């Protein structure tokens, strides 16, 4: 798969369309897309391990994180490959998302076909929280929006 | 991927909850859940290509089609990856879903993971309607439920 995309949905009406392409295998993968009814500031932003959504978001499980590493930024080293950082929602409660990331992909070992794209209610700490829970969770607290990441056309 | 998962939703009643399980690599996948608000008798059950469904069920495009045959039953070597022919409604409007299939997979190019399960309006013909649209998508008319396959724990 060279192209993927999202549907987000929860309650607010928390909800959006999020686009991936992927020029190259062993290429960056491009994210972007608009997703409304947030609260103004930055919302926690990542790849969960399954496509699950049967009890809604929380089936999703942890972070996507095939190597066993801990929670960290999208630019660090240490981060699960499932750690895309956050979106910022402007005062009309809308996120414009635009990221390139060199950890996920399409194809291979990271692929994220498949997997539970989530928003978050909270911030994410990018593990520099000085908890336990920050280098796990990055404390972005419950699941705003969620859905399937599918091979588009 | 040994497990798969997929929500079904609609615009009207239609609902369900479908499992996949696949024991060995290349080996049979096993097909198991319940759909509910079906009109009693046969409703076409296919794969489509994308797991795209930003503008719901139509959005997932044609049957998974890899090897570039004509439709058929499951049963048939003349077919799709995606033809699963259909599932039975009783008179509450309950399918019992429970298939064994060999040619999808959840690995390889026959890989099912990231596209669109479909429940169908109409029983599909497996190919046996004689017009030109029964190899193609065998008649079964609107799209009532469809989701994403996502991998599952
Ligand atoms: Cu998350
Ligand atoms: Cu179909
Ligand atoms: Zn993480
Ligand atoms: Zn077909």
């Given at each position: 798969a060279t192209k993927a995309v999202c549907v987000l949905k929860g309650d607010g009406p928390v909800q959006g369309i999020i686009?991936?392409?992927?020029?190259?295998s062993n290429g960056p993968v491009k994210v972007w897309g608009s997703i409304k009814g947030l609260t103004e500031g930055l919302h926690g932003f990542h790849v969960h391990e399954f496509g699950d959504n049967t009890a809604g978001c929380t089936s999703a499980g942890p972070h996507f994180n095939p190597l066993s590493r801990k929670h960290g930024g999208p630019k660090d080293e240490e981060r699960h490959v499932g750690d895309l950082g956050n979106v910022t929602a402007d005062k009309d409660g809308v996120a414009d998302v635009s990221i390139e990331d060199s950890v996920i992909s399409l194809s291979g070992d990271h692929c994220i076909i498949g997997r539970t794209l989530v928003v978050h209610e909270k911030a994410d700490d990018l593990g520099k929280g000085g908890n336990e829970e920050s280098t796990k969770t990055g404390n972005a607290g419950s699941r705003l929006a969620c859905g399937v990441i599918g091979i588009a056309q």
């Open positions: 686009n991936f392409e992927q020029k190259e």
